[PDB]
RNA sequence: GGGCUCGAAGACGAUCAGAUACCGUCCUAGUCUCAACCAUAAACGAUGCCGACCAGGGAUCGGCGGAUGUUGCUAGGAC
């Protein structure tokens, strides 16, 4: 048994989706979220910080009284 | 002292209205070196020297520290 917590399952899903795979370059202001660099050169993102930031963004979004005042847009085809 | 080459000056051949030029041909000084002078250049980064702070990134030269795997090589060298 040992049912996983919400954070556990969320991070498992993120790993399944490869959310933790960065690029070969790191922005100096994104370094605080990167865990370490692998021998290949791809930076590994700290999924705990990603989950915490997702929770923080949800906290910010929920406080908007009218959801119609929020606009979400994606330039790339994948995120549309 | 050297004097190959190129080549101020000079002399010719062209072009041109003229052509003391640009183009072509032959050449003196010079161009090289030694001894002694000269002390000037858009001698430019058109940007004094010393010292402190001040964003990010990838390359590159020299030295050094660490890790790691190869080398038709001799712990080292190359990566
Ligand atoms: K000569
Ligand atoms: K001459
Ligand atoms: K003329
Ligand atoms: K002089
Ligand atoms: K200059
Ligand atoms: K450097
Ligand atoms: Mg001659
Ligand atoms: Mg001389
Ligand atoms: Mg002067
Ligand atoms: Mg070096």
From TrEMBL:
Highest taxon above the source species: Eukaryota
Coiled coil region boundaries: none
Subcellular location: Cytoplasm
Family to which the UniProt record says this protein belongs: Belongs to the universal ribosomal protein uS2 family.
Biological role stated in the UniProt entry: Required for the assembly and/or stability of the 40S ribosomal subunit. Required for the processing of the 20S rRNA-precursor to mature 18S rRNA in a late step of the maturation of 40S ribosomal subunits.
Subunit comment: Component of the small ribosomal subunit. Mature ribosomes consist of a small (40S) and a large (60S) subunit. The 40S subunit contains about 33 different proteins and 1 molecule of RNA (18S). The 60S subunit contains about 49 different proteins and 3 molecules of RNA (25S, 5.8S and 5S). Interacts with ribosomal protein S21.
Protein name per the record: Small ribosomal subunit protein uS2
Lineage: Eukaryota, Viridiplantae, Streptophyta, Embryophyta, Tracheophyta
Gene transcribed to yield this protein: LOC107764229
């Amino acid at each position: 048994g040992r049912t996983l917590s919400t954070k556990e399952a969320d991070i498992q899903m993120m790993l399944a989706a490869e959310v933790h795979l960065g690029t070969k370059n790191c922005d100096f202001q994104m370094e605080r979220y990167v865990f370490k660099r692998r021998n290949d050169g791809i930076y590994i993102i700290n999924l705990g910080k990603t989950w915490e930031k997702l929770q923080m963004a949800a906290r910010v979004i929920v406080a908007i009284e009218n959801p119609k005042d929020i606009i979400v847009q994606s330039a790339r085809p994948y995120g549309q």
